[PDB]
Amino acid sequence: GTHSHGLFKKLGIPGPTPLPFLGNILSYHKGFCMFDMECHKKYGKVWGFYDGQQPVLAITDPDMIKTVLVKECYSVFTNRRPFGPVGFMKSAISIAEDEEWKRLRSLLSPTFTSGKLKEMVPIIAQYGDVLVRNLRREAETGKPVTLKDVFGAYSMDVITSTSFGVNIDSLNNPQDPFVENTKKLLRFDFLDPFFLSITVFPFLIPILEVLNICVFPREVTNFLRKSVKRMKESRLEDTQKHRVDFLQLMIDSQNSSHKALSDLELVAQSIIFIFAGYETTSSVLSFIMYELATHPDVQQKLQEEIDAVLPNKAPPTYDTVLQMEYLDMVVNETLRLFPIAMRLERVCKKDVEINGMFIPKGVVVMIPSYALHRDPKYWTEPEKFLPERFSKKNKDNIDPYIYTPFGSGPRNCIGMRFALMNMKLALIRVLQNFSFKPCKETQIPLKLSLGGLLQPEKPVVLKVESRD
Amino acid sequence: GTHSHGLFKKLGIPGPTPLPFLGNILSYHKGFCMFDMECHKKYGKVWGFYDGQQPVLAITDPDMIKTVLVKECYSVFTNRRPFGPVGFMKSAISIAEDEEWKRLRSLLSPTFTSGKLKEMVPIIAQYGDVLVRNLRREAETGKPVTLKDVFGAYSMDVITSTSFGVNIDSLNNPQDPFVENTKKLLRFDFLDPFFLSITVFPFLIPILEVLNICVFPREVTNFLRKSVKRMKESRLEDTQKHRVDFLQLMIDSQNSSHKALSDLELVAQSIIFIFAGYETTSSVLSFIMYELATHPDVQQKLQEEIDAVLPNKAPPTYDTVLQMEYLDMVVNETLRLFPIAMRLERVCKKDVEINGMFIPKGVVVMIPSYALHRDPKYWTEPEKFLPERFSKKNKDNIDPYIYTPFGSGPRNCIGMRFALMNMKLALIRVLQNFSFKPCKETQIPLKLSLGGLLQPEKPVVLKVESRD
Numbered sequence: 001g002t003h004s005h006g007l008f009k010k011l012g013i014p015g016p017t018p019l020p021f022l023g024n025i026l027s028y029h030k031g032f033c034m035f036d037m038e039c040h041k042k043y044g045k046v047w048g049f050y051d052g053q054q055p056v057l058a059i060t061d062p063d064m065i066k067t068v069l070v071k072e073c074y075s076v077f078t079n080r081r082p083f084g085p086v087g088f089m090k091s092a093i094s095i096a097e098d099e100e101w102k103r104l105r106s107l108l109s110p111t112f113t114s115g116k117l118k119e120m121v122p123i124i125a126q127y128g129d130v131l132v133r134n135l136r137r138e139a140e141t142g143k144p145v146t147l148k149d150v151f152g153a154y155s156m157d158v159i160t161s162t163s164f165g166v167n168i169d170s171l172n173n174p175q176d177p178f179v180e181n182t183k184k185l186l187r188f189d190f191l192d193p194f195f196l197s198i199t200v201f202p203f204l205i206p207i208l209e210v211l212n213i214c215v216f217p218r219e220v221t222n223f224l225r226k227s228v229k230r231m232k233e234s235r236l237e238d239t240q241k242h243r244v245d246f247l248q249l250m251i252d253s254q255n256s257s258h259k260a261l262s263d264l265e266l267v268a269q270s271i272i273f274i275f276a277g278y279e280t281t282s283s284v285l286s287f288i289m290y291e292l293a294t295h296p297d298v299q300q301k302l303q304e305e306i307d308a309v310l311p312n313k314a315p316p317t318y319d320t321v322l323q324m325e326y327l328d329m330v331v332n333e334t335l336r337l338f339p340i341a342m343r344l345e346r347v348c349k350k351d352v353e354i355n356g357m358f359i360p361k362g363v364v365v366m367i368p369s370y371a372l373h374r375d376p377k378y379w380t381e382p383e384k385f386l387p388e389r390f391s392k393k394n395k396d397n398i399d400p401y402i403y404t405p406f407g408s409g410p411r412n413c414i415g416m417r418f419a420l421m422n423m424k425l426a427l428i429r430v431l432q433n434f435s436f437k438p439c440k441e442t443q444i445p446l447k448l449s450l451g452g453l454l455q456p457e458k459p460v461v462l463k464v465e466s467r468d
Numbered sequence: 469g470t471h472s473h474g475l476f477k478k479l480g481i482p483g484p485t486p487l488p489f490l491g492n493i494l495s496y497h498k499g500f501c502m503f504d505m506e507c508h509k510k511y512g513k514v515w516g517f518y519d520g521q522q523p524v525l526a527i528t529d530p531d532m533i534k535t536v537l538v539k540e541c542y543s544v545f546t547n548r549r550p551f552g553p554v555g556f557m558k559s560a561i562s563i564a565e566d567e568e569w570k571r572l573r574s575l576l577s578p579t580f581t582s583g584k585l586k587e588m589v590p591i592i593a594q595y596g597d598v599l600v601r602n603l604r605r606e607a608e609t610g611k612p613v614t615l616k617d618v619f620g621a622y623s624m625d626v627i628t629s630t631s632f633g634v635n636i637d638s639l640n641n642p643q644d645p646f647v648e649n650t651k652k653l654l655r656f657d658f659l660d661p662f663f664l665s666i667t668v669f670p671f672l673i674p675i676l677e678v679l680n681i682c683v684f685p686r687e688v689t690n691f692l693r694k695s696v697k698r699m700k701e702s703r704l705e706d707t708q709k710h711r712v713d714f715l716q717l718m719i720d721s722q723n724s725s726h727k728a729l730s731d732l733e734l735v736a737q738s739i740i741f742i743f744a745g746y747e748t749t750s751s752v753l754s755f756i757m758y759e760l761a762t763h764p765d766v767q768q769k770l771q772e773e774i775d776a777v778l779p780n781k782a783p784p785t786y787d788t789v790l791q792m793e794y795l796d797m798v799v800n801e802t803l804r805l806f807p808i809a810m811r812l813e814r815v816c817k818k819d820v821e822i823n824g825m826f827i828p829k830g831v832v833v834m835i836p837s838y839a840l841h842r843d844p845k846y847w848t849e850p851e852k853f854l855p856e857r858f859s860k861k862n863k864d865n866i867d868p869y870i871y872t873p874f875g876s877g878p879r880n881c882i883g884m885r886f887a888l889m890n891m892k893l894a895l896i897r898v899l900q901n902f903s904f905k906p907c908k909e910t911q912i913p914l915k916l917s918l919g920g921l922l923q924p925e926k927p928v929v930l931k932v933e934s935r936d
């Protein structure tokens with residue numbers, strides 16, 4: 001069982017000594033972030049470890065990161081770490097490899113332009129108003145408020161309407177078929193027993209694929225495949241009600257070099273957009289409101305900036321959202337402290353030599369975002385929430401390969417601008433109406449989960465008083 | 469279990485209807501050759517079938533075959549069908565894929581030039597003399613002679629001396645450690661229960677690789693890895709006795725673009741050369757002596773040609789072997805009737821469109837050599853042994869993509885000239901001394917095995933009388 005455990009020694013690369021069969025997974029007992037921080041302060045700029053038999057090489061040099069993420073992306077570092085069983089979701093752009101990905105990224109790029117986003121802003125803002133009416137019902141009743149519930153329902157409303165044109169107040173329709181299914185698309189905890197078992201027994205993945213066992217649950221995928229079918233037909237009939245959702249943008253793409261999106265590929269992308277945006281958006285928004293509640297000074301200044309740009313609670317628009325600097329600064333600093341990706345990864349497909357370091361075929365090159373976002377070498381007082389880092393005066397010292405909450409290069413986050421616009425639109429409408437103060441039962445300082453997802457240990461609960 | 473069984477229907481390609489899970493493997497009850505002949509006369513120029521879930525596309529068009537074997541070899545049809553578990557023998561040139569193969573083929577090409585073969589001919593001829601002394605011991609005693617025994621011992625003697633410099637009369641040293649180990653390298657019967665099981669459960673191959681279970685038996689591979697080690701050291705010490713074996717040619721290659729052969733790669737090639745030459749050479753030589761014994765006219769003419777070129781039983785040399793035309797004609801016609809490969813195969817690595825036919829990614833493109841060698845469209849009276857086909861007058865009508873006993877293109881047989889020279893050298897020395905006549909217990913007509921290897925059903929036994 002000590003087959004490949006000798007790689008990093010032959011190359012002279014340091015790291016924690018692995019155990020037979022297990023590799024270094026027992027060190028994940030405090031999550032990915034704490035393991036990366038510990039390895040960083042312990043072994044320096046580069047180190048190696050083993051997820052079972054799989055070797056992983058961590059890199060922290062911003063010149064080296066640029067070579068992996070940008071310069072040699074097509075040639076060597078094109079794909080992410082394999083995982084499964086994935087079934088047909090192999091066709092999702094985030095999972096596809098080599099030429100299949102390059103084609104899918106080429107097909108989906110016009111869907112995420114600033115023009116299509118501009119046409120989605122009125123839809124997103126509608127549920128910012130819905131978010132305020134539900135927040136006010138929990139504010140006129142003096143009761144502590146679980147953020148991820150009210151931000152989860154907001155993210156759900158934005159997803160259903162901007163990806164399928166389905167318009168629901170999901171907080172008050174918890175058993176609409178579209179809401180209960182979409183709510184089941186929970187992010188993967190790679191440290192739970194099932195995924196840790198697969199990590200230790202990767203040879204069992206082909207056995208699960210032949211039995212049609214899938215990490216994306218069949219019941220939800222079957223419901224969306226048929227729902228897309230019914231919408232693709234009905235949209236052909238009533239063809240006067242113009243739509244501006246991802247489904248409609250992808251339906252149109254099939255009406256043109258590359259092959260057009262197949263009907264199954266189209267479903268795969270629609271599903272992966274939900275996974276990408278649903279718990280991510282609500283998690284970040286909760287992190288933001290925590291930092292705003294623990295720093296009343298920052299919250300007031302943002303509320304003053306919003307009222308200067310949008311007097312009299314004027315509705316946020318596309319151009320006015322991008323106008324607010326302190327809002328962008330608050331969002332960025334919160335993502336520095338809580339980069340929910342935790343890591344960026346690329347599989348080394350060829351025996352390569354970059355920046356003087358030899359990297360052999362099969363190694364997973366990893367960029368530890370959570371650690372680099374808190375590295376004293378680039379951030380003074382990294383544990384403190386200080387949005388002034390991202391002011392126009394100081395944003396020249398921020399290295400774009402140390403700060404990668406959306407990745408970088410050709411395979412970065414394709415929904416970055418959408419996610420930023422979505423979160424800011426929510427933040428503006430919420431702060432125009434409310435202020436957020438800690439409870440007695442608020443966890444200060446916030447503690448992170450020991451699991452495989454960057455989320456609070458306990459839910460963030462805050463008191464919400466109206467600005468009336 | 470009927471997952472991929474719908475491919476050839478969507479493409480409109482005919483073939484036998486597959487069963488769930490099994491595919492079409494139950495049709496292998498008469499071997500590969502009879503299944504290919506039956507499918508050819510039944511479905512035409514192109515057909516498809518399933519080895520379990522694996523789709524296989526058979527092609528018979530010589531223009532299409534050239535595109536697969538030659539024109540699009542590097543781009544699309546580079547590798548052979550995956551099989552396992554293979555362990556470290558993944559590094560053998562016949563098993564390696566993509567850039568690994570292209571490098572290994574580049575490293576091994578100078579080893580198989582006509583110059584290195586010219587320097588090996590004296591060694592090979594030595595055991596042609598040994599073959600005659602052992603044949604005569606079985607001829608002065610009137611007793612029927614099993615060909616594959618006396619040709620197996622000859623092929624063994626040629627292999628040990630031309631690949632390792634180990635010089636043994638293996639027929640009379642059956643328990644030299646080098647002889648009993650090398651004799652265990654038996655060709656793979658892909659129709660025996662184990663390989664048929666792997667075909668039906670290909671998802672179990674990763675489970676066997678993690679347990680170091682290997683189709684190349686460990687005991688023999690361990691013996692040769694250490695034997696090569698001891699020879700690589702001892703050859704460095706006594707460095708005046710010049711050697712002309714494959715091991716010495718590959719030892720020298722490590723003393724130079726590409727990376728040099730590693731010590732493990734070098735062992736992998738040495739092993740695969742034995743698999744390639746051991747039972748193949750003795751099988752063909754047996755087939756040749758059968759056709760010569762069933763056609764006394766052809767045998768006398770060849771004996772007269774040999775005596776005209778080499779009067780007084782003169783020893784065959786490099787230039788005199790290539791001089792004999794009827795010898796080349798006899799060898800070729802026997803390989804037409806018995807192309808021990810049976811099939812050539814290439815995996816389709818990309819969605820391609822060649823000669824008007826669309827071929828999708830993952831399909832195994834197969835060229836049925838045994839069937840094309842007996843196709844009435846190109847061979848008049850194909851079931852009859854008629855060496856005049858390969859005379860200089862008639863060799864203009866022979867299509868090099870219908871007649872492929874050594875394959876074709878960049879990935880053809882690299883030891884073709886060696887194998888032809890080895891077999892002819894044996895044939896000359898044998899026919900200079902003996903004549904071969906059928907027994908009562910000789911199977912006339914010869915019947916083929918129902919297994920996965922092109923070999924006689926019963927051993928070819930012939931009477932051997934001396935030409936004294």
Ligand code: HEM
Binds near residue numbers: 105284405409414418
């Ligand atoms: C706060 C919200 C989000 C964050 C922090 C985030 C972050 C990230 C990160 C770090 C990556 C990997 C980048 C890399 O490997 O270099 C990624 C990939 C991706 N994201 Fe986002 N994301 C968010 C929301 C979204 C949304 C709303 C979408 C909507 C479509 C989306 C679509 C994608 C896709 C498709 C990929 C894979 C791109 C590819 O493989 O080519 N993400 N995201």
Ligand code: HEM
Binds near residue numbers: 561563741808813880
């Ligand atoms: C009567 C004897 C032999 C016959 C009929 C024969 C036939 C063949 C055939 C049909 C192929 C596949 C060609 C293709 O896929 O297009 C092949 C491949 C090969 N043969 Fe031979 N062979 C013989 C003996 C030998 C010998 C003595 C060697 C000694 C080294 C050898 C070395 C190889 C190798 C290395 C390959 C794989 C080439 C590659 O994958 O690049 N063979 N042979």
Ligand SMILES: Cn1c(=O)c2c(ncn2C)n(C)c1=O
Binds near residue numbers: 051081082199
């Ligand atoms: C720890 N880990 C990951 O973090 C991971 C993964 N596949 C994708 N990711 C992100 N696998 C298999 C894994 O073991």
Ligand SMILES: Cn1c(=O)c2c(ncn2C)n(C)c1=O
Binds near residue numbers: 083186187189190275
């Ligand atoms: C955390 N995580 C992953 O790490 C992941 C994923 N899909 C693929 N991967 C690798 N999803 C949906 C996810 O939530």
Ligand SMILES: Cn1c(=O)c2c(ncn2C)n(C)c1=O
Binds near residue numbers: 192195
């Ligand atoms: C616990 N668990 C999972 O977490 C899981 C799964 N299939 C996919 N996932 C993610 N199965 C079968 C499972 O038992």
Ligand SMILES: Cn1c(=O)c2c(ncn2C)n(C)c1=O
Binds near residue numbers: 214215216217218
């Ligand atoms: C948590 N979980 C899953 O997430 C899961 C599953 N089977 C499939 N999936 C996706 N099982 C049994 C499960 O317990």
Ligand SMILES: Cn1c(=O)c2c(ncn2C)n(C)c1=O
Binds near residue numbers: 095276277280341343
């Ligand atoms: C880190 N990460 C990814 O790696 C990712 C993604 N969507 C697709 N991928 C691959 N999202 C939302 C994400 O946060």
Ligand SMILES: Cn1c(=O)c2c(ncn2C)n(C)c1=O
Binds near residue numbers: 094187272277280341
């Ligand atoms: C939240 N999230 C995702 O949603 C995700 C992912 N990889 C793929 N996806 C979709 N990773 C690493 C992730 O953290």
Ligand SMILES: Cn1c(=O)c2c(ncn2C)n(C)c1=O
Binds near residue numbers: 519549550658667813
């Ligand atoms: C029938 N068959 C072959 O003929 C074969 C093979 N791998 C190589 N060959 C030649 N496999 C897996 C196979 O099933």
Ligand SMILES: Cn1c(=O)c2c(ncn2C)n(C)c1=O
Binds near residue numbers: 658
């Ligand atoms: C018949 N046969 C094969 O079909 C084969 C092989 N090695 C690999 N393959 C595919 N050997 C040694 C073999 O004898």
Ligand SMILES: Cn1c(=O)c2c(ncn2C)n(C)c1=O
Binds near residue numbers: 660662682683
């Ligand atoms: C019958 N048989 C084989 O034929 C075989 C094998 N491993 C490799 N081969 C070829 N095992 C384990 C086996 O039982």
Ligand SMILES: Cn1c(=O)c2c(ncn2C)n(C)c1=O
Binds near residue numbers: 683684
């Ligand atoms: C015939 N055979 C093999 O050829 C073999 C094996 N184990 C490994 N090999 C290669 N066993 C058990 C076996 O019966």
Ligand SMILES: Cn1c(=O)c2c(ncn2C)n(C)c1=O
Binds near residue numbers: 745
């Ligand atoms: C058909 N065939 C092959 O396919 C082959 C081989 N040696 C290597 N390969 C791949 N030999 C001797 C062979 O006869």
Ligand SMILES: Cn1c(=O)c2c(ncn2C)n(C)c1=O
Binds near residue numbers: 562655744745748810
């Ligand atoms: C005899 N033989 C081999 O020796 C061989 C092979 N494929 C690889 N090898 C080595 N095939 C198909 C084969 O028939």
